[PDB]
Design a protein around this ligand. Structure first.
Ligand SMILES: *[C@@H]1O[C@H](CO)[C@@H](O[C@@H]2O[C@H](CO)[C@@H](O[C@@H]3O[C@H](CO)[C@@H](O)[C@H](O)[C@@H]3O)[C@H](O)[C@H]2NC(C)=O)[C@H](O)[C@H]1NC(C)=O
Ligand SMILES: *[C@@H]1O[C@H](CO)[C@@H](O[C@@H]2O[C@H](CO)[C@@H](O[C@@H]3O[C@H](CO)[C@@H](O)[C@H](O)[C@@H]3O)[C@H](O)[C@H]2NC(C)=O)[C@H](O)[C@H]1NC(C)=O
Ligand SMILES: *[C@@H]1O[C@H](CO)[C@@H](O[C@@H]2O[C@H](CO)[C@@H](O)[C@H](O)[C@H]2NC(C)=O)[C@H](O)[C@H]1NC(C)=O
Ligand SMILES: *[C@@H]1O[C@H](CO)[C@@H](O[C@@H]2O[C@H](CO)[C@@H](O)[C@H](O)[C@H]2NC(C)=O)[C@H](O)[C@H]1NC(C)=O
Ligand SMILES: *[C@@H]1O[C@H](CO)[C@@H](O)[C@H](O)[C@H]1NC(C)=O
Lengths: 374, 374, 374, 374
């Protein structure tokens, strides 16, 4: 027995594929082993995304895995919902409910707002980038209207990095003269590293400057540059480096080689790779459950073409989606459990603030409870 | 000759299709004829959009006309950029550069910011609809950050129609608590009509209030019910009914036997339908120029399917794009001129206010010259 | 044992006929039956009213039910008082005393004056209509003369359906010039609805104003429009919807169909039709009382001619009149009891105010007690 | 050359009948005679009015002359407008356009308001009655609202004569409490006589108190009872006794005995009787016009009854109306010219003021020209 699955990875995602492969070899069951097809492409390109999706659908896959960007989330969700093909992804949650999509990255708007309230902020600057959607920006603006916050939102995606050296100085001087020492960096890791590099270059990390990084990879990026800068630096993390599961996984990970497993000869892993490991775990758990329920979702023939009119759905896909959204498993990113929509629930987000000795967990955040200080 | 094009009209777009037929029957001549294949679909469904798009592509069409939405713009842009097939649309301009896309709606961020500066505002509210995009919201937020404004951004897109009566009342009660006198409505015609109805019901159209309708169709709405309220109302208009071309078009549009041409037997025309008429005009002009240039654009049924692997485009696409972007003609929207990215330049937006004797054009806005008061 | 009665209804008053039939079937048979002749006409045309009255009298009817207007009240009064034929009517009470006429509508002049005194008005406006007489206008003027008020009486009746908007806008502009915020509407349902639409259009339903609907049909109008404006809206109501009889009737009435009972599928009921129902009850009770007294009212022969000279009145008409004015029952309007002149006594008018949550009763008015607050 | 006309007169009208007979003998042309039938009846009884009208129509009359009051005007107007029978009346004009009715009494609201403005009045009192229509009161109130007047309107037509002492004493005490030295008496002859008697009794007829008699007959009342005292007393006059025609008529009028011509041997004639004489003149000359036009209008006892179903008119009656309403003559009232409605157009109202010596003309009022001074 073997279930065919599809894999989508961007051009430059080596650690994610390495983590997927280690997860496959780890939770591979002798009763049934997944046969994954891996397609490398430009995740921003919707044409390439739909090409790969239709190729996988023609191959007759039961659960598609892969990433999506701001420019392909719509087509991915639309094709999955119309064709009843389950999609598992560690990318940003969709801006609203979307069937047949398994969002494994927990929402961070709640944790970010709780951290702002805990720090008791009234006015700050929101440095955002349109790469993970503007849902966090909308949530911040709505909460600012509710709580009477003086938030100044500045976009950094549109400015070309060539000419974006004087505008950084201008807006930083504006913040300094307005005493806007509180900033939030809602950007991808590369953009966050670029922004903090410019911050150190311009010397805008003096005492009083409280930086908040709105991503789950706080330690995954570079923090040794502002370790002793005397600036309040905070962030969030979904993977805990203390529990036994992640400890043993990291041992088995750093004991690997960087030749056949790129991006695996270190101790610090990315939350995307950890969530891909967790996705392998949830996939094998749900397929095992479906097999144990005496349901053979195996399609007799090929699924056909995606474009073929009228749409060609299949109830085995709905069954696979139902099995996917009914799994409760412990993993690297914490407790894994989903709603009927596909979003992730029952999760804990560890909050840490950078100090001179290093980042240290100042507490944890969940959904059933507000921010907790540890 | 006979050149075949495509159509992606939405399901519920009748006036735009009527304007399309009117433009076809007017600009049609003995030189050549335009044979379109019109598909009525859900512009929000990317799967349906893809089906229609490469259905027309397999039909071997030369250019495509239609609409899109924030949930399907990326699919259209990627498909056109990859298959080199042009796409003329009256929908919102794409947030950035996209080749083989001709956008007929002029940008409104610059005109709106100029109008706000002319009115000398410092604390106002911005009611935006997430179902259409947030480019204008991003622009106004950046300007406020660079000009020290107090913008209260409130989303009115998630408001369902089952209880969209108390929601607006509570929203405006909160605005009154915040002492908000000036409001900017960045919504479509139906949404702004609902907001105006709620404003009138809760009696918030009295003297001392200001409203700015952030859309090109100022006179498209039922603006008569708020005309006698006594509150400042400002907006933008793209079609000048006092122009000879617009008057001559209306002279035939008002007597079009509405049963045959839906939404025609009236003196007002929505800016989307006006841009559809202008799109027919510009397509005819571009094809006439291309043929009169001694260029062979013969194409047979060799297009294949949109998901061909590898996807080889046709060489006539770039020449059609160049011919389409080199058109300088006059229409209902005014002067029509495109840049190297497909966006419109050398255009004029008429800023209007609402008075007790009807709307009046106080001035005009341009991209080379800022707001001008007459 | 069939008792012959008559019926006059206007061309457009169908809910009143529906309520008449509902009462006719509610008290169908106790010890006899009632046989009505229904005649529809223009109630404001005295010739048609006389023709119908003469035809019904020639048909040998015992009592007559029907409406009248300011230009047809005198004819009905004179014919009834000379031919000794009773006339039960829900129309406006006659400006004086008149025999053989039963006026079901309670007087509103006392309640209106008491409400004005309770609100402590000194300067206000009085929008009257030349539709139901100017008796209330004369009473208000006399009271103002005796209490040192400043009444601005304006007629809103002599306007056509071609410049109503302009006329009302000019009237309220003059009202603003005089700085009058307190307004009284002596109009009926349609006229007050038009005035409400116009005042909403000009934006004068906001806080700082006060309107009194001087008619018993407070909730019968469309008060949903001004319920959220923030201005006081008072009124009067004769049917008490949270009663026992009223609730039972509304349950039995909202279940009917508009196909067979026009205007009889709603949770509300106009006071005219309610008084029609109570008139049916009153006539049935009066004839049951006459049967209990064992008096033969059967005519010796044909009634004769309506315009007979000399006019000889049948003596049994006086007994019919006494039975009509002697009955005392409880219905929708409340305690129904008449005096020697046919007017209503021992009645109660429920004063209502239009709050945001809805029209809430604030007290009741009687003839032996002044306005009582609860 | 033999025409039947109908006559309606109140039970107690003598001078009007005498003037009717005077006009009949004075215009008894040898070409044709107008044989009248006189019906004496209580004009305030709509049934009696209808009976007489139906009898006259049944015998086939061509025109009807008579009077009415506020309780019998609608019956006459409706019956005339339905059966197409002309009706000449010196009574008060109807408050609108009523066909087939000739109103020889000129309106007085315009002259009254012109006199008020010429006397420079801002606050005064207006004592009226409900026995001659409320059109003058409505006009006074509308003009007061337009010109910022303070008018005290008090109705004195609802009181009896035994309680008149106390009622009028309280009324004049209230007038003194407002210091009302300027009053307008829009009442009938008996009412104004009682008013002036009570004024003399209280002693308020001293200089300073200004009285205006709002009727055309300022010689019929006790013009000498209140003449002494120096009090301003004004009034109107439609008859001019200095005119040659009026003097020649009254020269015979005085010589006529009282036996067969009641109320004739006097130097003063009521304006109602003057309008009766003018009515005889106008019907006679209109029938001369009809006879000279070569038109046969022969009617006899064949018109049937008034209550015929369906009520069919008789055609040449509209020709009677056209002859009546499209003519101009000279009479006691002056120039007699009617419009398409039936009201006078080119009347000249004279204005009289009272001193201790007696009445004296002040000026004249016309429809095209305002108050005139001499
Ligand atoms: C950077 O991190 C340090 C870590 O201690 C922060 O120090 C303390 O931060 C808290 C809250 O962030 C401050 O409490 C505040 O006190 C003021 C009264 O001065 C009160 O009005 C506020 O509502 C809030 O409770 C606390 O004062 C501050 N200092 C100490 C010694 O505890 C610091 O605030 C962080 N930010 C910056 C810009 O330094
Ligand atoms: C609705 O539109 C009217 C247009 O008349 C607005 O009136 C504006 O009121 C402001 C008051 O702040 C005026 O500004 C003043 O300008 C003078 C001269 O520069 C300056 O000395 C004052 O200190 C003040 O700044 C403004 O001139 C005036 N508009 C015009 C055209 O004169 C009204 O405010 C608008 N309503 C709302 C709610 O925005
Ligand atoms: C509308 O209603 C309010 C509240 O009842 C009125 O305000 C009151 O006015 C009276 C004078 O008549 C004062 O004595 C009270 O103090 C006021 N407040 C309250 C809470 O009663 C108001 O006058 C009414 N009319 C208008 C035009 O606003
Ligand atoms: C009554 O008549 C007298 C004289 O005809 C009026 O007396 C003067 O009228 C003028 C008119 O504008 C006033 O300016 C004077 O002040 C009046 N003088 C006096 C002593 O009264 C008088 O106004 C008329 N009306 C009344 C009510 O007396
Ligand atoms: C803009 O359009 C107008 C009208 O066609 C034209 O006269 C003008 O030259 C254009 N401007 C430029 C810069 O081409």
């Amino acid at each position: 027995n073997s279930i065919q699955i599809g894999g989508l990875f961007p051009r430059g995602a080596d650690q994610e594929y390495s983590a997927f492969r280690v997860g496959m070899v780890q939770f591979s069951t002798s009763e049934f082993r997944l046969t994954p097809h891996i397609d490398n492409l430009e995740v921003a390109n919707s044409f390439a995304v739909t090409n790969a999706f239709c190729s996988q659908f023609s191959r007759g896959v039961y659960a598609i895995f892969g990433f999506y960007d701001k420019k392909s989330v719509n087509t991915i969700t639309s094709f999955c919902g119309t064709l009843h093909v389950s999609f598992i992804t560690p990318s940003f949650p969709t801006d609203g409910t979307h069937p047949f999509v398994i969002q494994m990255r927990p929402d961070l708007k709640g944790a970010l707002l709780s951290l702002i309230e805990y720090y008791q902020w009234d006015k700050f600057a929101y440095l955002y980038d349109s790469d993970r959607g503007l849902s966090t920006l909308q949530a911040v603006l709505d909460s600012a209207a509710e709580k009477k916050w003086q938030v100044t939102a500045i976009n950094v995606g549109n400015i070309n990095n060539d000419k974006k050296d004087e505008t950084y100085r201008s807006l930083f001087q504006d913040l300094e003269l307005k005493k806007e020492r509180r900033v939030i960096l809602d950007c991808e890791r590369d953009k966050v590293n670029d922004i903090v590099d410019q911050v150190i270059t311009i010397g805008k990390h003096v005492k009083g400057y409280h930086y908040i990084i709105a991503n789950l990879g706080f330690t995954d990026g570079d923090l040794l540059k502002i370790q002793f800068g005397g600036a309040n630096v905070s962030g969030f993390q979904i993977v805990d480096y203390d529990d036994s599961l992640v400890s043993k996984f990291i041992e088995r990970w750093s004991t690997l080689e960087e030749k056949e497993y790129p991006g695996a000869h270190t101790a610090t892993i990315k939350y995307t790779s950890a969530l891909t490991y967790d996705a392998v775990q949830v996939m094998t758990e749900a397929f095992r459950n479906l097999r144990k329920q005496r349901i053979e979702i195996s399609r007799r023939g090929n699924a056909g073409d995606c474009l073929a009119n009228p749409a060609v759905p299949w109830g085995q896909g709905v069954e696979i989606e139902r099995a996917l959204k009914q799994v409760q498993v412990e993993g690297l990113s914490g407790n894994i459990k989903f709603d009927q929509n596909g979003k992730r629930i029952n999760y804990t987000i560890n909050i840490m603030e950078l100090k001179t000795n290093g980042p240290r967990k100042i507490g944890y955040w969940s959904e059933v409870d507000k921010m907790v200080v540890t």
